[PDB]
């Protein structure tokens, strides 16, 4: 049978994983890095590509 | 002296409070209710107040 410590390990793990997922979600909403995937342009002197 | 359960109670409490604060932060960033505190207007026919 599972001891009390073995069960606590699983519950506390779930609580810290819940926290980790919430914190990741905060950081995405606030400061997720944004890729510049490409560029295009029309500029003077025929500068029509980057 | 404090038992193991009494100490676990305090640690698990901190983990669930950390989670609760993170979840509240998510809900603020995503869907915090916004008060309309006042209004003003200029509309036809001299309708210059709400």
């Amino acid at each position: 049978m599972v001891t009390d410590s073995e069960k606590v390990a699983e519950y506390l793990r779930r609580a810290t994983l819940d926290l980790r997922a919430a914190r990741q979600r905060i950081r995405e909403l606030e400061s997720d890095p944004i890729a510049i995937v490409s560029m295009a342009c029309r500029l003077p002197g025929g500068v029509n590509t980057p | 002296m404090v038992t193991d359960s009494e100490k676990v109670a305090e640690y698990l409490r901190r983990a669930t409070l950390d989670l609760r604060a993170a979840r509240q932060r998510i809900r603020e960033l995503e869907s915090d209710p916004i008060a309309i505190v006042s209004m003003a207007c200029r509309l036809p026919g001299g309708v210059n107040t709400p």
Partner: antibody
Amino acid sequence: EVQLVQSGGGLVQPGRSLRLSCTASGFTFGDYAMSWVRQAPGKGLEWVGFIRSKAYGGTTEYAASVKGRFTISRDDSKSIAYLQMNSLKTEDTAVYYCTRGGTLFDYWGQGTLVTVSS
Amino acid sequence: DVVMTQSPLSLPVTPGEPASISCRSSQSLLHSNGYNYLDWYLQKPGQSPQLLIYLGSNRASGVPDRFSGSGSGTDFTLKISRVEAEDVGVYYCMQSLQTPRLTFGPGTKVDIKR
């Protein structure tokens, strides 16, 4: 994301053997106990057995109805849990679920139907 | 000395409206650490089980926040604030004081009120 992908079941005759697998992805498999739970057609969920993580000794426990016929093992390098089923009987017919956790079953495989029939 | 839980056999529900599932154990599930060792699971038809609530009142990440749990000792409730039609299936309250759990029991069959 967390995935538990089950395979290896199907039709089998009484007395024969099958090995079910549960292939995990998206978490550290080696940190979790893994459990098997089964559901005979139209019936409730019955606990089959489970295996502990290495952190708690890697040992197994089994329901009395399968003890001495079924064995659970794990491969932490491939992230697979196995259910080895020997001496299968018709009443073993069931959908077999693998689940993460030995006490808290917080993520479940999609299930594998095993039909024992001659 | 075996620890069992019982919940209602059936429970018709109405989408838009709340629902409550009660749970009673043969023995207090309150541990010295302050938590009740009672978890709630749901099996939707043709789907595998899923966790909803652990240690009485903690909602796992990704579970809709219309689900909550409460209670203590021997009496527990799963509450759905506003039922959705996708919430039909079998709900199980499972004690974790005594392991292993050999069965999930008959659970509470939730279906559409009419």
